[PDB]
Each structure stands twice: as structure tokens, then as C-alpha cells.
Amino acid sequence: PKTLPCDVTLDVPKNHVIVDCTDKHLTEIPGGIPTNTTNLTLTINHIPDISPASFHRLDHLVEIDFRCNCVPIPLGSKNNMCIKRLQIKPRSFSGLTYLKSLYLDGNQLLEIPQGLPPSLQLLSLEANNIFSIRKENLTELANIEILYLGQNCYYRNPCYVSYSIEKDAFLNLTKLKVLSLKDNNVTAVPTVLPSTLTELYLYNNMIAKIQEDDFNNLNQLQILDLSGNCPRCYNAPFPCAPCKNNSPLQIPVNAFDALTELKVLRLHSNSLQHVPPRWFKNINKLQELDLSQNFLAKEIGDAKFLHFLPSLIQLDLSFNFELQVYRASMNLSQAFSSLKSLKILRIRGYVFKELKSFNLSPLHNLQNLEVLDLGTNFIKIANLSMFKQFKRLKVIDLSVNKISPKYARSCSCYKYGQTLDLSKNSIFFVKSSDFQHLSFLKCLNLSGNLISQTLNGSEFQPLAELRYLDFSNNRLDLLHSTAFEELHKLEVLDISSNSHYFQSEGITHMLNFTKNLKVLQKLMMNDNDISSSTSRTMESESLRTLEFRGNHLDVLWREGDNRYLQLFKNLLKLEELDISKNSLSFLPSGVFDGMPPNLKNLSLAKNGLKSFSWKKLQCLKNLETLDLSHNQLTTVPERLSNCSRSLKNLILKNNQIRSLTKYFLQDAFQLRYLDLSSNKIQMIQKTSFPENVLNNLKMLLLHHNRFLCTCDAVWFVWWVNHTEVTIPYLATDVTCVGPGAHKGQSVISLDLYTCELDLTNLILFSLSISVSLFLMVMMTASHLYF
Predict the structure, then answer these.
(1) Residue 382's closest CA among 427, 445, 336?
(2) Taken in order 626, 592, 635, 641, is the CA torsion positive or negative?
(3) 362: Cβ–Cβ under 8 A, 6 or more apart, which residues?
(4) Phi, psi (5° rounding) for residue 280?
(5) 685 near 719, Cβ under 8 Å?
(6) Membrane spanning segments where?
(7) In 3-state terms, what secondary structure has residue 489?
(8) Pairing verdict, β 327-329 and 164-165
(9) 323/334 Cα distance (integer angstroms)
């Protein structure tokens, strides 16, 4: 509890006092950090160097984050610059006997910092300039377990020198478990690595050949990443350095021999034309195998190696097409039936023309198969009915094809069941015979297909058990109220982004098409520009949430047009209304009387309300999350108690409010959430913010406003000092606009003794003038009386 902007978190059972100064623009480490802290965070700031006095009296530290104080030239933002790289003073971390982690990613260091404590377990030196490692600098790290030495030399952080490794640099690190040498311009794997390895990340480097004595001692390794070595970078958006003569990564047949406990092996972008089954001879517990961006278009037709993969879970074979070849069909081998435990199978980038039913014959007996991704293949003809055999599947991805009817933080309808993702294809009209034998489908994605058709209730007939419908980025013409009528079990409908036919004026728009939907629970109709509707009301006995943003309601609720005032009135069970971004300039008095009775979530964000009425909120006796963000309203209500007694999540972000009422939160007990950030509010008084109601607020925001922190409301300056109310960004964002020398000041670090306190100054002045006049009168009378 101090004036520091770093967020504090206390956990007694874990003995964890976490202080986080994430992205606060620090210049030096602030003083007064408690000795009970264990996790420390100093990310993107402006810290010049580290001194032994930085962590002097702190001995209970276990995690220190010093990531990306000033990133390299193209690795981050160009608006924050450091005059020079980071310099580590000697004996800067040995005083931390309880240290177990250190993050120094993105500090442009030239060598590994020396003097680290032996209790150090985690270490990361990514995005730095270390391109040479020695044993004399690693002898102090004989107890580390996690070592992240990646992103040191590549196309974004160049060093112009190959990654040099002296012999047996990582040998004496018997406790090291994972090693990441990614993006370091590595030429050869550092032999020899410790036998206690568990993850080896040498991916995205320049290794051209693999030795038979490379992984000879790694018997406990579980994940091995060799992706990007000799890559296939045709039409790549990033600078690449391919191998000589377009040769793939040279891995011997007897290279993965000692690797028994290996579970994940990624070989993405290795220009691999052949993969012998001898590589998978000794590894029996492989779960994930990535082979993307390779030349395996001829190997996928054979695929003998899969006869040695009985426990495989994931198999990524994406983007294996050969250039300037548009195959007429996809060739899968029968060995695809040998991956008993296969779950996820993505065959993207396998460009071909026609997908026949018998082309997926080896996949007809995979009981554990749940994912079947076949997108980005430019498939033209594909009979959907053939998917009547993949009923046990979970997702059926048919995306942008033309079908026709390492913990490192940077510095849908899958929950409903079976889905058929037909997004961004070439369907321009929907027929009932096309979706035949597809009753088991719980979801259906038609987004981005641009279907121009008026539905009369006979298109999606075989879809009896459908529960989710995506119809975004299309052109639906709402002529009949019987649209989607045959969808008896449909719960969620997405008709958003269909502004074409709804923009036209004169044609009918039967918005009451939800009456025939008895189990519909959600409806997305955003970005439709609906300006007219022949139906006066909307009917639905089960719709609870309605997203109605991105339209035109200033014309439907136009002055004098009382026809569309009770649009959402018949929505009996509606509890979440998202009518926003509709250019609503003023609220017509009477629409709140035609609002759903069970309405709980009302949002009016990014509209343009010039004057929002508040006394009309009494008609909504169930509203709790009124959202009025990014508006243009000016005056706050007089008394929030007389306006509503169930509202608790008032959100007033990015509006133009100058000052609150004298009794804003008077007797308002039910509210637990309020936002007044990015405003022009200048003063807040106690009569409007009494502690009896402020004691229960879960969250309150008052940042990015124009507070003039003068003495005129001195107790306000005191109220922020001694009061326990969750106000985030209290020291870096909510600042002072004035006056004069007090500009840029934080509200928590304010203390104004300017105003006289209890009126003792007047008493003293009165006493002084009385004493003076009394002495004058007494002396004059004494002179007169002699």
C-alpha cells in the first residue's frame, strides 16, 4: 500500500507478494519496495542499468521480470529509445539467495551476466546480442533448469556472425531440462547436450546437417523442435536463407535412436522431400508430429512411416503443395488407417480440385478422430452428403476452398457439437438436397459466401438438430416471416453483416421472423444498416440475448414516428440487448415503456447520445449492466436512487462529463460497478460519494480525466490517500491538469495543506487585533488620566 503504480497481489498460503510494474515508463527502480515480495516485474520502461543496490535489502525475491527495457531496432516500438544497451554491474544478483527465475529478454546484452546465485532455476536471455557462449560463463549456472537463449541472431535481430559454441558448453549443466536456441543463426547443434534434457528448441536456425552422434545421450527428451532449418520460403513474407541446391535438412536414418520418451517432434518448413520410417523406429510414444511447409506431396501418397506411429495424436501436414500443379484429386495412403489414436489431422495447403467420397476412405475407421481440417486447398466440387459417415467427428473444416452447389509473452460453435465450417466458399444459393443426410450437424458456418437469396422456410430442411447458424457476410432478403422456420431446434442465429438488402428502401423487412423460433436463445444481427421494417414488432418467447448494433435507429425511432417504439416489447425473456453504434442522437420518450420486462443487459455504446434521460430508467426494474460507453452525453442524473434500484454496472467511458451532482450516489446501495474514465470531470465531493455506499464497490475507474487537483476540495485530495476502494491506474494515468507547478502530478502522491484547517486562523487574528486595540485604548486612557 504505497504511491507506486505497480499492482500488488498478496497470497499468504503461497507466501507470494507479487509487485507488477508492467508498462509504467519507469526510469529507476522506486524505493520502498517491501521485503515480503517474491515476484517482481519491470517490463517495457526506461531503466538504464542494474546496480547491486537495486536488490539490496530484498532477500525473499523468487521471480524477477526485466524483459524488454529497450527492444532492438526492429523488434518493437520505435517511440521509446535508450542511449545504449543494458550494462550489468558485478555482484548484482548474488545477494538474492532465494532467487529462482530471471527474465532478461530484449535488453541488447552482449554477454551472459555473471554473479548469478546458484539457486537460479529459470533463466531467459532472448532478443539479445549474445552470439558466443563459453563454459567459463556457464560454470555458475550448474543448477539451472530452464534456459531460454533464443532470438539472438536472425533477420530481425542480426549479428552477422554464426552462433559459435565451444566444445561441451552445456555438459556440466546436469540440472538443465529445456533449451531454446531458436533464431540464433546456429550452424551446428552444440555437442554435447546434458542427458537430463526434456525439451530441445533448435528451430528457425541455419543447421544444414544432423550428426549421428548428436542426440546420442538425450534419453529423457520429450519435445524436439527442428523447424525452419533449410526452410521452404517460396513467397514468404519474411527474409529467408534457403539451403544450397534446394536441399532439405540432412537427418541420418539412425539419428532418433536414443530418443525414446520423445512425444513432440516438429519438422515444419524443412524442405523435406522424403521422411524414412527408420526415423520413427525407436520412438514409441510420439504424440505430436509437425511436417508443414515441406515437399511431402509425393510422400503423403506413400506415407509408410505412419506404420510406426501407433500413439500419435496430432499430425500437421499443411502447405505441402508443389508449385504450378493443380491436382484433380487428393491422394491419401491406406497407412492413414494405422494411426489408432489420431485426433487432430490438418491437411491444409494441399491444393487440389475435387474431393470425392472414397478419397477419405482410410479415415472412415478412426474412432478417436475429432478434427478434420481441409482448408486452403481450392477445392471446387465436393459432395457434402459424403460427410454422413463422419458423424463421430467434432469439426469439419471446409474453409476458403471454392466449393459450389515455450511460455514467452510478447514485449464459436465447438461447444455445441458437430460443426460444418463452410465459411468463405463459393455458394451463391442454398438448396435442400445439398444439406441432405446432415441431420447430426449441430453447427453450420456460411460466413463470407455472399449468398443472395430470400428464404421462405424450405432451404435448411434436413437440418433438424441444428443449433448454431452462421450467415455473416451474405445478402439475405427478408421477405417472409417464415424464414428459418424449419429450424425448430435452432438456439443461436447469426444474420450479421448483411447490409446489402437491408440498405434498400421500399422492400419489405419482416423483422418478426423470430416468432416461429421456439428455442432460439441468441441472435446476432450486427452491421446490417436496417433503416426500415414492415413488421411493427418482434415476437420471441425464448430469445434472451439480442445483438442489434451497427444499424440505423434514428430513422426507425424518428421524431413523430411512434410505429417502431415498441420493437423489443414482445421480447418477453430478453435479458441482453446490444443496440449500439446506430447513430442514435436522442432517445425518443416512450421506447423505455416498450422495453422487455426481463431486460438485464442494455448497451448504448458508440451511439452519439446528446441527452440521455435518466428518470425513465424506473420502467426497467431489472436492468443491472447499463452500458453508455463512448457517448456524447453531458449531465449525470440528479439522484441515482430515484432512477433505478437494481442498476449495478453503470459504464460511462469516453463521454463528456464536467461535474457530478451533489447527491449522485445518495442512498444508492445496490450498485457495485462504475466507470468514469476518459472524461473531463474536475471535482468529486463527499456528499455525492459517501463511504457508506463506497464500501461495497467492486471496481471504480477515474483515469485519463482532467482533474485539477487544487485545494478547493482538499478532502478529495485526502479521500484518495486513506480509503480502500479499487481504483486502478491511480499513479500513472489519472493525473492533474493543473494548476501550474502541479501539472502531471499523481492523485495518490498529493498532500495539500494550503487551505487553513479548522478556523483557528480567524480566532488568532481576532485575538491579535483585540489585544492591540485593547493595549492602545488602555495606554491612551492611562495618558489621559495621568
Answers:
(1) 427
(2) negative
(3) 332, 333, 334, 335, 336, 337
(4) -100, 35
(5) no
(6) 762-782
(7) coil
(8) unpaired
(9) 25
